[PDB]
């Protein structure tokens, strides 16, 4: 607010409260893993090159 | 008496019981 110099200024609340509502949105994506490669990774065998 | 090969080659791990092992894992859910 600006200090007045001509008119008598009315008193006011210097702080106001506003309410905002939120919007919701999901995002999803699938992906797939072969079992054979998963067994390779899991079972740690290392004998041959 | 004839000397036959003892293993299925040399390129994969040896034991022939692999059928029981994989199935058992499903139940539970040197070269």
Curated annotation (Swiss-Prot), chain B:
Transmembrane stretches, start-end: none
Disulfide bonds: none
Subcellular location, record wording: Virion; Host nucleus
Subunit-structure text: Homomultimer. Makes the hexons and eleven out of twelve pentons. Interacts with triplex proteins 1/TRX1 and 2/TRX2; adjacent capsomers are linked together in groups of three by triplexes, heterotrimeric complexes composed of one molecule of TRX1 and two molecules of TRX2. Interacts with scaffold protein; this interaction allows efficient MCP transport to the host nucleus. Interacts with capsid vertex component 2/CVC2. Interacts with the small capsomere-interacting protein/SCP.
Function: Self-assembles to form an icosahedral capsid with a T=16 symmetry, about 200 nm in diameter, and consisting of 150 hexons and 12 pentons (total of 162 capsomers). Hexons form the edges and faces of the capsid and are each composed of six MCP molecules. In contrast, one penton is found at each of the 12 vertices. Eleven of the pentons are MCP pentamers, while the last vertex is occupied by the portal complex.
Family of the protein in this entry: Belongs to the herpesviridae major capsid protein family.
Name of the molecule in the record: Major capsid protein
Gene source species: Human cytomegalovirus (strain AD169)
This protein's encoding gene: MCP
Full protein: residues contained: 295 to 343 of 1370
